[PDB]
């Protein structure tokens, strides 16, 4: 291993204790605590998952009956199941808010290079673990998700050979695959916790509250002065979530997206194909699959989403050349009579109106993609929704292309102002 | 030749005393002797805080919180001034709503229009009269 220079911080118990006992945190706001919120809900998820795993027998024909039996004969099994589900929801919300905050703050320089790849890898592992648990739910939705994952995995091998059998077997939820996926869920969840801990230890190099340097040298000690604020902000977030859920989700409701979970595998061999609906965090993926009916193009888009979520500092960055890289863009249309362009450098955040406009358009595009599920029946027959297609195209254009992330118009406008001012006052 | 650097260059080596126990006969080396090697993260965890800082004519005064207000400046100017003006106008509006009210309004209106058109197409599909 001659290409390895070592580890940034060797993970030892004594060194961890010392580092966390003399670690200091600069003055910040509530928008910069999503990472610790995610750590708290990850720990709660681990504990509640252990509690749940002490009662789940990995047999598809026994899981619903055992879940019913353990609810009435124990005091806290259903409480821990509710905790585990709400922790999944909070994990998704916090991770997406964290990613959006980093994208807005433009943490795409070589110093933020380390914290990006690890975070994206953690996000992929988190989504894989979520998929494993969703399959473990053992309902019709679990079967549909398993079938979709098996088909997408087989598309890699082009449908030749049963290369998926070691994990998915016959693409159904039989005892062998249930055992394999349950054990994989547990092990990968603990590995997820370790990876998140590594990523969170990789934070201290460049830690900021806002995009503006504050110039303050004194900072608070983490163990009490910052931990108390983190816990209090977590409490406030929980209170807001409770208010919104109480006043937004009356019980009972006329219709819900969870009615597709009534069907039990084995017990009910008839599937209501009309009301196929996943949880809200895979709703964008199902919407993309419905909008793009091509199997190869849909898989390409699904992979390309993570492919461009990763490589983000590569597409947008200083690249160690101090903004002397010559990029190829066709949008300039030879306005300045040149093909290659110097990368601009005056990409501020808190006062960049165009950057704020583009970022908020992207965020609202993501929200609209998440908002609803396209009804697969008569969807493309009635020409579908133009807004969904526009949102998908804008998301792909914004994340992939660099035309809007670091525009050249502001840079050239600033040089025009500079030249005019210097000509007027020699 | 029979010297450090072979008589050609200066080497700049050092003896760490990390793997040594005794200074003289049965005289132990100081416990914190290894911290005297400057610029080494293996000697202390405080070296991870590597902010650039240099100044020479600076004095700072800090006071014990036990001689200060428990809640200083909390409601100066009253509800109207403090809460309304400061919080809402100066923080909430000035730092958030100026930045996103226009794109959020555009996105919300366009999404509502597109959803209404899609629902109207669905209604035409379902109802023939």
């Amino acid at each position: 291993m001659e290409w390895n220079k070592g580890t940034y911080m060797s993970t030892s118990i004594k060194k961890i204790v010392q580092y966390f006992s003399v670690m200091t945190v600069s003055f910040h706001d509530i928008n910069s605590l999503f990472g610790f919120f995610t750590f708290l809900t990850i720990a709660s998820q681990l504990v509640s998952g252990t509690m749940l795993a002490f009662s789940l027998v990995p047999e598809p024909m026994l899981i619903p009956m055992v879940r019913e039996e353990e609810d009435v004969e124990d005091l806290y099994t259903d409480d821990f199941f509710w905790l585990h589900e709400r922790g999944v929801d909070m994990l998704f919300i916090f991770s997406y808010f964290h990613l959006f905050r980093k994208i807005y703050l433009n943490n795409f320089e070589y110093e933020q290079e380390a914290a990006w790849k690890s975070g994206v890898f953690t996000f992929l592992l988190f989504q894989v673990v979520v998929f494993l648990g969703l399959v473990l739910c053992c309902t019709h939705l679990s079967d549909i998700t398993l079938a979709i994952a098996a088909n997408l995995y087989d598309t890699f091998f082009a449908g030749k050979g049963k290369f998926y059998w070691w994990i998915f077997t016959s693409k159904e939820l039989n005892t062998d695959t249930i055992i394999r996926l349950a054990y994989l869920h547990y092990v990968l969840a603990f590995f997820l916790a370790y990876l998140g801990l590594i990523h969170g230890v990789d934070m201290h190099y460049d830690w900021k509250n806002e995009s503006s340097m504050d110039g303050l040298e004194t900072e608070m000690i983490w163990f009490d002065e910052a931990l108390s604020n983190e816990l209090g902000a977590m409490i406030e977030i929980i209170l807001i979530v409770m208010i919104v859920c109480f006043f937004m989700y009356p019980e009972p409701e006329a219709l819900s997206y969870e009615f597709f979970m009534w069907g039990d595998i084995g017990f009910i061999n008839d599937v209501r194909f009309l009301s196929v609906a996943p949880h809200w965090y895979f709703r964008p993926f199902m919407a993309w699959l419905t909008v793009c009916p091509f199997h190869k193009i849909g898989l390409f888009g699904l992979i390309y989403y993570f492919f461009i979520l990763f490589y983000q500092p590569v597409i947008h960055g200083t690249n160690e050349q101090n903004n002397y890289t010559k990029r190829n863009v066709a949008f300039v249309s030879f306005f300045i009579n040149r093909s290659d362009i110097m990368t601009p450098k005056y990409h501020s955040v808190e006062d960049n109106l165009l950057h704020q406009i583009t970022f908020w358009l992207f965020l609202c595009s993501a929200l609209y993609v998440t908002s609803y599920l396209p009804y697969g029946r008569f969807y493309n027959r009635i020409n579908g929704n133009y807004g969904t297609l526009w949102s998908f195209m804008y998301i792909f254009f914004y994340l992939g292309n660099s035309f809007l992330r670091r525009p050249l118009i502001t840079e050239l406008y600033l040089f025009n102002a500079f030249v005019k001012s210097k000509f007027l006052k020699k | 030749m029979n010297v450090t650097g072979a008589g050609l260059t200066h080497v700049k080596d050092f003896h760490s005393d990390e793997m040594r126990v005794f200074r003289g006969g049965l005289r132990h080396i100081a416990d914190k002797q290894g911290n005297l090697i400057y610029g080494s993260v293996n000697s202390s965890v405080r070296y991870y805080h590597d902010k650039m800082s240099y100044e020479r004519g600076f004095i700072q005064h800090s006071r014990s919180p036990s001689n200060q207000f428990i809640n200083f400046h909390f409601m100066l100017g009253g509800f109207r001034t403090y809460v309304l003006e400061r919080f809402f106008k100066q923080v909430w509006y000035r730092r958030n709503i100026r930045t996103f009210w226009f794109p959020v309004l555009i996105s919300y209106t366009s999404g509502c229009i597109t959803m209404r058109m899609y629902d109207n197409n669905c209604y035409d599909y379902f109802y023939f009269s």
Partner: peptide, 30 residues
């Protein structure tokens, strides 16, 4: 972000246009 009420899809959830659904909860309060 806004959904019709006369298409039988309550709050944008589609798939239940073939039956009466909202009587207990939305249209009337049992």
């Amino acid at each position: 972000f806004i959904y019709r009420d006369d298409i039988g899809a309550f709050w944008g959830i589609k798939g239940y246009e073939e039956l009466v659904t909202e009587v207990g909860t939305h249209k009337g309060h049992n």
